[PDB]
């Protein structure tokens, strides 16, 4: 058996093409953190207890604060995260509605 290669120009990467990592795999990775602050919106929304990189506890209703205290990988997820950080500096409120 055994499979050949496609192309070796680089040092060891990964490419997410055909909009796949965008049209499906990105939407659903966003949905994971969409369902997160979906239950934090408004007065009936629930707080989330987040233990950071140094063991310090942080509990917040805020989307932007709750997202700032997480370590994130997925690039397309990171996009809406900086967007929640945008409306944090530029209005204070609405951070949960950005998301």
């Amino acid at each position: 058996p055994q499979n050949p290669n496609a192309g070796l120009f680089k040092q060891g990467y990964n490419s997410y093409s055909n909009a796949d990592g965008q049209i499906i795999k990105s939407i659903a990775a966003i949905r994971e953190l969409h369902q997160m602050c979906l239950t934090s919106m408004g007065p009936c929304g629930r707080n989330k207890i987040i233990v950071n990189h140094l063991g310090k506890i942080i509990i917040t209703n805020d989307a932007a604060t709750m997202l700032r205290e997480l370590d994130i990988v997925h690039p397309a997820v990171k996009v809406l995260v900086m967007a929640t950080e945008q409306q944090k500096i530029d209005m204070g409120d609405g951070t949960n509605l950005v998301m």
Binding site: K48, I50, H53, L70
Partner: protein, 77 residues
Amino acid sequence: RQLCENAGFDAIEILNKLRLAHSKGEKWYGVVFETENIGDNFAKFVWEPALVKINALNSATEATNLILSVDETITNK
């Protein structure tokens, strides 16, 4: 119920004979450790400041209401 369970009293036979006797015997009836039974704690001289009991309850709830608010624990490596 705990002061009883600690001292080894009958926890249910004291609370049961206390709840009944608190609706007819007024506020100051509590556990008198010296006879293993119910009694007025003014004359028993069991005294404690105002702040203790109000700050106790105001905190005990702050905790209880904070924990129920939590729906997700995320912990990083």
